[PDB]
Amino acid sequence: MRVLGLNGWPRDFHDASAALLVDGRIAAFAEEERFTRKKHGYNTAPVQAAAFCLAQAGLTVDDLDAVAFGWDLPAMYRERLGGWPHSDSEALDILLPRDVFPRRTDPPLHFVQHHLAHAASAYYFSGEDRGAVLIVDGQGEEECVTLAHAEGGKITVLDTVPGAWSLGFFYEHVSEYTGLGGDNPGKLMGLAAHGTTVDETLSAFAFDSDGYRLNLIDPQARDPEDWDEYSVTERAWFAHLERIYRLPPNEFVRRYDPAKGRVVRDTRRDPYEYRDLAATAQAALERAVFGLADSVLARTGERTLFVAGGVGLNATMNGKLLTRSTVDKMFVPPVASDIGVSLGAAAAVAVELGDRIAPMGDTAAWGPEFSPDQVRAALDRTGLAYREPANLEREVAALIASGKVVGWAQGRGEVGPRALGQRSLLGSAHSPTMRDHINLRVADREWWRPFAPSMLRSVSDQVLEVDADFPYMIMTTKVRAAYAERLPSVVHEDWSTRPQTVTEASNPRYHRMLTELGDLVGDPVCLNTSFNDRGEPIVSSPADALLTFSRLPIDALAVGPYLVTK
Ligand SMILES: Nc1ncnc2c1ncn2[C@@H]1O[C@H](COP(=O)(O)OP(=O)(O)OP(=O)(O)O)[C@@H](O)[C@H]1O
Ligand SMILES: Nc1ncnc2c1ncn2[C@@H]1O[C@H](COP(=O)(O)OP(=O)(O)O)[C@@H](O)[C@H]1O
Ligand SMILES: [Fe+2]
Ligand SMILES: [K+]
Ligand SMILES: [Mg+2]
């Protein structure tokens, strides 16, 4: 079957994306923000993402067997807004506007329960017959957690936790409270390592062997003036945090900066001041999730764990789950957050139509790519001088080895929040100054945020405690003896790293470049951070890449077969 999965809707929505499954294979998959250049794909149907999916596969909406949406949207409208007003035809017009998506007739429209869609995005793509499913995000239609059993192509729900007890809202609210912002929970995670935990309950959580309790909030509390429990949980957490924590909420400051010529936003306090709150929030999330995972694993009798939902992006928590006595194998897709429910809704529907879903296979490179002619066109636009190296991979290897920062734009854009050698900024993993150089001089990131490494899968065994595939940079692990000293720029406060393992199959060019690199610095490892300026999404087009390259004190840009220098 050909099934187009969708996320994103014009009203109060985030992380719009589109995914096209052809006979269980990912034909194309991209996030709206990459095309709009507006981070998080807020309040929109995934118009551009779906246009790309169809163009990539050479299809039109008339060639689709089904369109799948990753939430039970009619149900949310019925419950929270007094009725679902749209015929399937009218819903399609909104999701896939006719001026961009001409169609003779309407494809069958399927609405998939949000957490099922999450679950589908992990199970069906993991390459594992069966396992325990843990879904933890902000909130689906009603629930914030789902425990389920996956076996023989079926996902069966054992239990859910109501939205008011959301661990994602919780973590988001703490992230907002510190000044990092509720849209930047990943930063809270990186700040945790720098602080100290004293009471991992925050006088709110009570932990047990199957999970947690939030005696702070009535679990059946509900916003009658909205369609999720964000605002209710926000008021409760903010009041509680202010009550028990020495610092009041950090405030946002909007002021004209005559240096930028603009009103810029900042924080009244340095978020680094809240490092103990971050540590404590991180510890509480871990503890709560450990209980949930132990619980679903035991109730199912499985020892393989599938995790998805937005909290699933907590790589630190993931790494620690992996090493838990109760877990032998773990799969967490690069698209754990809502970006992944388009793909999940599509799989659920495809499987329902009799298809078998192929494993992801250690790659996330499903977005657009660009030919040499298309790249050259973008280069000539700018009038920049460039070369076409005989051995680009070797030249990049050498640049990196000498302490230079190289933009790397090749092949099909990766999907999800991590760059994985399709749209990356590259630098020495071996340099004890590279990290401060990129944070402070290049990207204006907070000095306390860590960077992460890409390395060959064939030496990952010797570099890292664990010998597993880490294709997605969605898990932290410990660095073996005594590489922990050899790789200063990609190590975090606690000797953990958040690695990408690379196989020749998954990324030949990148694999080859790392190989060359190894001959020069001994180790086929590099620093790999995402290719973007501070506000914007990861660069997608060759034009995006040039623009960002012009704006950053980077040394070179390797885009397609071409090398551009500063
Ligand atoms: N080994 C590690 N241990 C703990 N945290 C880590 C580790 N490696 C990376 N991180 C954190 O993961 C975060 C990812 O968060 P997030 O996705 O919000 O950043 P980003 O979107 O890449 O940043 P930007 O604002 O530049 O787009 C990093 O900012 C860093 O704080
Ligand atoms: N690194 C992280 N650690 C913990 N929670 C995270 C992290 N990244 C994202 N989240 C959580 O994901 C939640 C939203 O997840 P998602 O499933 O994408 O949306 P929704 O909750 O609307 O379905 C947010 O509440 C956020 O706190
Ligand atoms: Fe979700
Ligand atoms: K283990
Ligand atoms: Mg980044």
Side-chain angles (χ1 to χ4, degrees):
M1 301 306 203
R2 303 190 198 106
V3 181
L4 182 67
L6 298 179
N7 188 46
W9 182 255
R11 186 208 284 243
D12 303 320
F13 247 76
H14 65 91
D15 294 290
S17 71
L20 177 52
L21 293 185
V22 176
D23 300 329
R25 299 194 161 287
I26 299 169
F29 187 14
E31 312 166 48
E32 195 66 4
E33 67 160 20
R34 303 299 215 277
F35 309 92
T36 62
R37 310 310 302 160
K38 296 177 174 187
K39 221 184 171 191
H40 302 133
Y42 287 121
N43 298 327
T44 171
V47 182
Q48 305 209 37
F52 155 72
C53 283
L54 296 186
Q56 177 72 21
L59 304 180
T60 66
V61 169
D62 292 315
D63 301 320
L64 302 165
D65 299 287
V67 169
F69 192 85
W71 295 72
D72 192 345
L73 208 44
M76 307 164 66
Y77 265 81
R78 269 157 203 145
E79 182 67 39
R80 316 295 288 257
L81 296 168
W84 170 244
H86 306 305
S87 64
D88 286 348
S89 192
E90 286 153 347
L92 283 159
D93 282 337
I94 290 156
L95 288 170
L96 300 167
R98 287 169 176 278
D99 66 337
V100 179
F101 301 99
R103 67 188 198 252
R104 300 160 170 84
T105 62
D106 291 324
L109 180 67
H110 303 249
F111 289 101
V112 181
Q113 294 302 119
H114 184 61
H115 277 205
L116 176 55
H118 271 311
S121 69
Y123 182 23
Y124 298 123
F125 297 92
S126 71
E128 300 289 337
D129 296 337
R130 55 200 288 118
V133 171
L134 180 57
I135 307 307
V136 185
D137 61 354
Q139 184 182 6
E141 302 83 359
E142 282 191 77
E143 62 292 309
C144 65
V145 177
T146 285
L147 310 175
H149 199 170
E151 61 178 304
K154 271 159 202 306
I155 308 178
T156 305
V157 173
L158 303 188
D159 260 319
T160 63
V161 182
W165 280 14
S166 166
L167 296 174
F169 286 167
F170 158 66
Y171 201 85
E172 234 181 289
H173 298 329
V174 174
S175 203
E176 182 76 359
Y177 190 101
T178 64
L180 298 163
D183 44 345
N184 290 296
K187 286 164 136 198
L188 194 58
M189 183 173 71
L191 182 62
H194 291 273
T196 291
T197 307
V198 8
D199 169 20
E200 63 192 22
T201 68
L202 292 164
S203 322
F205 286 107
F207 304 105
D208 58 67
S209 56
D210 304 291
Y212 68 100
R213 286 178 195 269
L214 213 44
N215 309 307
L216 175 72
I217 306 81
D218 168 25
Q220 312 300 348
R222 240 152 125 290
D223 211 352
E225 296 302 349
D226 207 344
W227 67 3
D228 75 4
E229 272 48 272
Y230 193 85
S231 284
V232 169
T233 66
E234 191 188 44
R235 298 199 299 275
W237 281 107
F238 267 73
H240 177 77
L241 293 184
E242 191 175 335
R243 193 171 70 68
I244 69 138
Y245 189 66
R246 48 181 207 98
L247 307 183
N250 199 346
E251 294 186 79
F252 293 92
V253 176
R254 283 172 82 210
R255 295 181 71 188
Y256 184 77
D257 184 346
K260 309 300 186 59
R262 298 186 194 182
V263 171
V264 302
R265 192 171 88 148
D266 205 346
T267 52
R268 200 55 171 90
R269 290 173 138 104
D270 185 345
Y272 185 79
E273 290 184 33
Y274 295 72
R275 59 195 178 290
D276 296 341
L277 183 61
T280 312
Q282 180 66 26
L285 184 71
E286 295 177 351
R287 185 101 127 84
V289 177
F290 293 165
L292 302 165
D294 286 351
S295 188
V296 77
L297 285 157
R299 306 176 56 170
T300 62
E302 308 287 347
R303 293 189 60 82
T304 293
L305 179 67
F306 301 129
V307 177
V311 177
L313 286 168
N314 199 282
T316 292
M317 168 199 78
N318 286 343
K320 303 187 183 173
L321 276 165
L322 181 62
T323 74
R324 244 177 132 59
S325 61
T326 50
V327 185
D328 300 328
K329 315 235 247 176
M330 208 169 153
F331 180 79
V332 179
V335 292
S337 78
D338 288 3
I339 61 184
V341 302
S342 56
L343 178 88
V349 172
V351 166
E352 181 194 290
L353 300 172
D355 277 6
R356 288 183 305 261
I357 310 305
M360 273 175 199
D362 292 6
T363 186
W366 298 303
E369 65 185 322
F370 299 88
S371 73
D373 292 354
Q374 290 162 338
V375 175
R376 194 165 68 255
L379 289 176
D380 300 338
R381 267 309 291 152
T382 79
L384 282 190
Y386 61 90
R387 293 176 50 233
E388 181 170 4
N391 193 337
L392 177 59
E393 297 76 9
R394 189 188 307 263
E395 288 194 31
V396 167
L399 282 163
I400 291 168
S402 80
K404 280 157 182 46
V405 177
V406 195
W408 177 266
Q410 308 281 326
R412 287 178 65 180
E414 54 273 280
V415 61
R418 303 279 79 77
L420 297 169
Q422 316 290 355
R423 300 294 188 284
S424 294
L425 281 178
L426 311 175
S428 178
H430 292 80
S431 167
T433 62
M434 182 48 63
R435 176 184 159 159
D436 287 349
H437 168 63
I438 298 180
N439 275 334
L440 299 176
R441 163 52 180 164
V442 175
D444 186 31
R445 310 214 313 183
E446 300 87 343
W447 62 268
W448 49 262
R449 325 238 308 262
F451 296 101
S454 296
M455 69 186 70
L456 300 178
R457 178 57 171 110
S458 62
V459 313
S460 75
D461 182 23
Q462 324 155 29
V463 182
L464 313 172
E465 309 288 358
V466 200
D467 178 48
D469 297 280
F470 292 103
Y472 312 115
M473 276 190 177
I474 201 164
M475 280 196 198
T476 57
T477 194
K478 288 296 191 176
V479 209
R480 264 194 199 270
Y483 282 100
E485 298 231 321
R486 282 182 74 76
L487 308 171
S489 70
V490 295
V491 164
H492 194 13
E493 211 63 21
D494 38 14
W495 282 284
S496 66
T497 205
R498 190 204 64 196
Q500 181 198 11
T501 47
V502 185
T503 57
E504 194 281 319
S506 84
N507 202 332
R509 269 225 218 243
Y510 198 41
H511 189 263
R512 201 185 345 261
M513 184 283 307
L514 281 168
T515 292
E516 289 289 354
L517 183 54
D519 296 332
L520 302 177
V521 296
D523 310 297
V525 181
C526 75
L527 182 149
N528 160 35
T529 191
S530 67
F531 191 168
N532 53 272
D533 208 349
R534 185 182 181 62
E536 73 178 346
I538 298 177
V539 309
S540 177
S541 74
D544 296 337
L546 292 167
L547 196 77
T548 296
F549 170 73
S550 82
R551 196 160 40 181
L552 300 181
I554 290 172
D555 298 275
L557 166 57
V559 56
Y562 308 108
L563 193 60
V564 189
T565 297
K566 277 186 194 237

